[PDB]
């Protein structure tokens, strides 16, 4: 249970922007402003519940129809949120509600929390081509908006899921590119080549979720989930790429993407971040210290669907290779935009190209997460390390190290508010390679530091020195703590010394084969900044017990003792972990003996309480008395006496009573079964 900067809104949070030391949440019916430093709400602006009407038009508002003849009151889901700074600094926000119609909030020249005082709706009335609606930006049923300055114009690239609600004179487009007017009072589409739309016929058939968009290398990229093919059952993730231009969508191509387990495919992309790699990861995936990589957290489809099961895998595509795959000359045609038939498609700026094969890459977690639904990813470098920030449908947030070589387990793992983790995320760095992520959960945004997380979580000395290097943790007698705040001169990052506190069974038969269970601490050895039991050695006197690694851990060891020929009592168990050794002076090689049994006879029905008598009958793991090959069920066990109920034979006959203690075997008196 961690304690972090914790802002909670009264309505769900769709979207999030950090600007000039403030945080702008785009929320259901709301936009909030929090302070970057402590997440206290400074200001609100109510985009509040709004009234839909055929007669009530898109930038004019109405309680002048509130009494309603066929008009509904509607929740204003935030779909987009862009700070723009080429013009005079302004928040542009785009709601779901008035045919997807953005407004600008203009910050006064000092108060930055002032979303409130100067706000213009953006809808210029349409006169040249009254059919078009370029101020209708966002789609109520799924949008991604990416804004970038280009050629002295603010450009808006926009992915929109679209559903055949044939809106007279206000249609929406599936992807499109429009610029603002310098008059700030309307968007314009530059030519008819500036949108590509799902054909009216398939507008329902089934749709195109837009998960993510980003600009890199002079292309715009969209990430997408849609229809391996049209009316074709199974779903699918693609990239969409096109030239970064006002003038229209130019070198348009969608190419499928495949994540696999190693084919076990994760066809539904859930979230994605784009960042540079650190050296370790770099080396491994095709490298370039200064290269853009698409980290994508994927998921497996419920068969014949687009909904995700709780199976996840993340895998990373350097955009440099994405391009290669796009450029390398095999090639289909855009089935959802052109016909499957007619010209262009029976042929080969102008053409729009689907690809027939995916670019595949393997899970980088290699199943580490194949039982949970990862819903959010983010990424950062610490020195050589590349670190994922992960989020889950169960509410769990966790920091992992990314690697092929090394199947790493998360060094941070815990519960954020029971509501799932949102794919909308912010990372912001500060000098010297720290910073924080802002992380949305239902309706709460949390400011999780990238690094310290804090250092006092670790409770044992071994776990403390296993902590990720960036936290810079050491052990101060009884706490995992940084050196600047250590109050004894006992702080260390190296001294993990072994320690035993219990060992069972206490003894073994001379034949051995007994597997010991040594509980304790720090039995492992941190090699190359990674713990294993490879340096661990278990010495029982002059012979060694061979460890079983699959059943052993840092706190408990498992090992089979070998055979001895002499009795030996009070023998020493030594355990070395590379740095030191620790002892346990209490183990014995017995030698169990049966002195007598009583009674020596009983009924064929069995149920006779058979008393075996002797010494060392309570070593080591398990006692198994038997008669006639049938089990003699135990009633009570001790060093000297073993009571058990004789099994039912189907014949009146004699048997020796055989006792089995691990690899030790013992016969004793014959037991007669009378009739």
């Amino acid at each position: 249970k961690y304690q972090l900067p914790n802002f909670t809104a009264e309505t769900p949070i769709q979207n999030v922007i950090l600007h000039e030391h403030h945080i702008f949440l785009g929320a259901t019916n709301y936009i909030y402003v929090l302070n970057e430093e402590d997440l206290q709400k400074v200001a609100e602006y109510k985009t509040g519940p709004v009234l839909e009407h055929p007669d009530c038009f898109p930038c004019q508002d109405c309680s002048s129809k509130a009494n309603l003849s066929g008009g509904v009151w509607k929740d204003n889901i935030n779909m987009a949120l862009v700070v723009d700074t080429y013009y005079d600094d302004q928040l542009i926000s785009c709601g779901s509600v008035n045919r997807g119609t953005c407004q600008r909030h203009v910050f006064p020249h000092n108060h930055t929390a002032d979303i409130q005082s100067e706000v213009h709706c953006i809808f210029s009335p349409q006169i040249e081509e009254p059919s078009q609606c370029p101020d209708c930006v966002v789609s109520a049923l799924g949008a991604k908006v990416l804004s970038s300055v280009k050629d002295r114009f603010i450009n808006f690239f926009v992915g929109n899921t679209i559903n055949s609600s044939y809106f007279p004179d206000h249609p929406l487009h599936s992807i499109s590119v429009r610029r603002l007017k310098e008059t700030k009072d309307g968007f314009m589409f530059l030519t008819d080549q500036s949108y590509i739309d799902v054909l009216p016929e398939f507008r329902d058939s089934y749709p195109i979720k837009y998960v993510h968009a980003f600009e890199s290398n002079n292309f715009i990229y969209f990430l997408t989930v849609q229809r391996e093919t049209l009316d074709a059952q199974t779903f699918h993730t693609r990239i969409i790429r096109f030239c970064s231009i006002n003038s229209g969508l130019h070198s348009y191509m969608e190419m499928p993407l495949e994540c696999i387990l190693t084919k076990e495919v994760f066809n539904i992309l859930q979230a994605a971040y784009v960042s540079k790699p650190g050296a370790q990861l770099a080396r491994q995936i095709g490298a370039s210290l200064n290269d853009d990589i698409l980290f994508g957290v994927f998921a497996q489809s419920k068969p014949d669907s687009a909904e995700p099961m709780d199976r996840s895998a993340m895998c990373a595509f350097p955009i440099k290779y994405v391009n290669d795959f796009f450029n390398k000359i095999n090639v289909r045609c855009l089935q959802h935009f052109y016909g499957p038939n007619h010209e262009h498609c029976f042929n080969r700026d102008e053409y729009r190209t689907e690809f027939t094969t995916a670019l595949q890459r393997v899970d980088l977690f290699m199943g580490q997460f194949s039982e949970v639904l990862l819903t959010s990813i983010s990424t950062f470098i610490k020195g050589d390390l590349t670190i994922a920030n992960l989020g889950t449908s169960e509410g769990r947030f966790m920091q992992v190290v990314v690697s092929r070589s090394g199947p790493s387990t998360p060094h941070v793992n815990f519960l954020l508010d029971s509501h799932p983790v949102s794919p909308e995320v912010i990372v912001e760095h500060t000098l010297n390679q720290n910073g924080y992520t802002l992380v949305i959960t239902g309706k709460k945004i949390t400011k999780i530091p990238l690094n310290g997380l804090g250092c006092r979580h670790f409770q044992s000395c071994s776990q403390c020195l296993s902590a990720p290097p960036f936290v810079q943790c050491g052990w101060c007698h009884d706490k995992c703590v940084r050196s600047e705040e250590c109050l004894s001169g006992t702080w260390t990052q190296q001294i993990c010394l072994p320690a035993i506190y219990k060992v069972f069974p206490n003894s073994a038969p001379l034949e051995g084969g007994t597997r010991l269970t040594i509980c304790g601490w720090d039995f492992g050895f941190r090699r190359n900044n990674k713990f294993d039991l490879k340096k661990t050695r278990v010495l029982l006197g002059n012979e060694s017990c061979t460890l079983t690694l699959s059943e052993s851990t840092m706190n408990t060891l498992k090992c089979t003792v070998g055979p001895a020929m002499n009795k030996h009592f009070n023998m020493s168990i030594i355990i070395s972990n590379g740095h030191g050794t620790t002892q346990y002076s209490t183990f014995s090689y017995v030698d169990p003996v049966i002195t007598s049994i009583s009674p020596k006879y009983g009924p064929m029905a069995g149920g006779t309480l058979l008393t075996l008598t002797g010494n060392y009958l309570n070593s080591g793991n398990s006692r198994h008395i038997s008669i006639g090959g049938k089990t003699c069920t135990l009633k009570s066990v001790s060093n000297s006496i073993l009571e058990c109920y004789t099994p039912a034979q189907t014949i009146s006959t004699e048997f020796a009573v055989k006792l089995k203690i691990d690899l030790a075997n013992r016969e004793t008196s014959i037991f007669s079964y009378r009739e």
Binding site: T85, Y86, D88, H109, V149, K150, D151, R152
Partner: protein, 155 residues
Amino acid sequence: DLGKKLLEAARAGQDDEVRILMANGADVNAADHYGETPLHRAANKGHLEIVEVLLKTGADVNAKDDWSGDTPLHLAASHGHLEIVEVLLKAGADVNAMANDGQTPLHLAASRGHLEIVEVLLKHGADVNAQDKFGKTPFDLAIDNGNEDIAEVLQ
């Protein structure tokens, strides 16, 4: 940071603050997120007064931003700040400087329709045959945007 204040004053239009901040040793070439100096911002918004003041203090008239690679002259040419264009050129702006897309202030003015600026740039000695990275001259851009008056001047 006086430089951040200078940047904000530059776009705000507070030429009093600009003069004061510079008197206090503000960085005349301070750069913001997009790599723009106070001079870029003043030129962008049209604050002729601030533009002159900054140049007097020693602003880099040929500084290019880190986003689009535009100089204050490029910005003035695009927006139509004829008076600023004149001052920048007198200050010693490179009339044939190109941005990241290979466009000169003449390319911009021609495409925007700023005949007055086109004439000034030509008189200064702008290359009317200079192509940009789209393979177009300012003349070509004038033709594309229907700016026949500019096209005739550039022809």
